[PDB]
């Protein structure tokens, strides 16, 4: 009820037009900026009491940055494109230590999201899915995040079937790309939290708050 | 705790 | 093509009629073997080449038991039930030092599986989306099992709708499951592998091949 | 390398 995918387009046109790492967390530290004014933009994300506004963002903002640069990332050969602008192929991250994961980014989301043309409406949809993450602990009202989770797949479905009638499996198709999102989003987690256990690549303020307690 | 994310919120 | 409900249902009813953590560990052990017949059953599986069968069950063994334990568990108060016919309860988890991951499964799992009354038709096919997981590295061909991954949610999601009428969401519902259990496995991975490292609490040799390379 | 699996899939 009250989930028109047009917003959610727009949150998602307004808030975008030598070691590889480095420059990928400050990307990330640069766009955590970003996911805030978009979650803002989100029906119903800021009427939420702030503490589960916090507790949504800290639980899926690496979830949700892999899916936009994943995304914004399609048109690129062998590499990621970063919102800084900059680009990082694929032998540089396997150079530089984190190929594995790199390569798992390259396979389960960005080839795929190209092969069956991944559009900005779906895109926007998938992301405030799992911004609506019911699961996350220390929800004051699960249920009320459960309902704005349901009014976003449902209005997803919508739009498939309706935009691309001649794929039915669309709808699930996008879906069964969140758990592959999961994986690859605890494993990026898991290096970030090497790098600053390390001591080497520069973590900004934002990011380095999103590794704090919790 | 959460200072940035919270200010970046609440305007 | 040719993915009937009918044959995923009988698979399900075909193979299933003082410390928690060793007793959770026989249990997996021994539903190893079951877990084969399992797959043996489901349509097409024993017609891919005996290499990506292989690769299926050893990337998805973990979810396909939890699932499957946790459905079981959807009458159990606070606690699971285990294939051998023990219960465990929360409080006997936590004082094994599980009480984290015990709870996640009894919040994200078996208390939403019994809240939307997940019957075993669904059950079954959710567990044969995860069994084939077009991600799975090594797979001589991730098309067919992307295709086969297809026919399952299409026969469910048919299942759906038809079966639950009044719940046009319980499909994607059903589908958004599927992240949680991907992350819990994960997490019951981990704990695996220190049991291992400790020393501590015995592990069967089926369940120790799975910890094996890759 | 996977004896036991190998073996029960084959049977
Ligand atoms: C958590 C995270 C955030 C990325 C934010 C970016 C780079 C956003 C953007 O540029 O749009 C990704 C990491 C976090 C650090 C490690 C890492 C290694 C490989 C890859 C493909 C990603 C990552
Ligand atoms: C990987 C795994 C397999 C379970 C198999 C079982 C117990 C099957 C069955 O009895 O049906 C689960 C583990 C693996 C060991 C650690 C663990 C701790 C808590 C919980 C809820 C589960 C687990």
Same mark, same amino acid.
């Given at each position: 009820e009250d989930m028109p995918v047009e917003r959610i387009l727009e949150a998602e046109l307004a808030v975008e037009p030598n070691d590889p790492v480095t420059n990928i967390c400050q990307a990330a530290d640069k766009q955590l900026f970003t996911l805030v004014e978009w979650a803002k933009r989100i029906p119903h994300f800021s009427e939420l009491p702030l503490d589960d506004q916090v507790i949504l963002l800290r639980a899926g903002w690496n979830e949700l940055l892999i899916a936009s640069f994943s995304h914004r990332s399609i048109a690129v050969k062998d590499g990621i494109l970063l919102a800084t602008g900059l680009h990082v192929h694929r032998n540089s991250a396997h150079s530089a230590g984190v190929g594995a994961i790199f390569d798992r980014v390259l396979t389960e989301l960005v080839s795929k999201m190209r092969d069956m043309q991944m559009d900005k409406t779906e895109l926007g949809c998938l992301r405030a899915i799992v911004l609506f993450n019911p699961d996350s602990k220390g929800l004051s009202n699960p249920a009320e995040v459960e309902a704005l989770r349901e009014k976003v797949y449902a209005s997803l479905e919508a739009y498939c079937k309706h935009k691309? %009638?001649?794929? %039915?499996g669309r709808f699930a198709k996008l879906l069964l790309r969140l758990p592959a999102l999961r994986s690859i989003g605890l494993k990026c987690l898991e290096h970030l939290f090497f790098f600053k256990l390390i001591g080497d690549t520069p973590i900004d303020t934002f990011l380095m708050e999103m590794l704090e307690a919790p | 705790k959460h200072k940035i994310l919270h200010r970046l919120l609440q305007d």
């Open positions: 691309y %009638p001649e794929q %039915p | -």
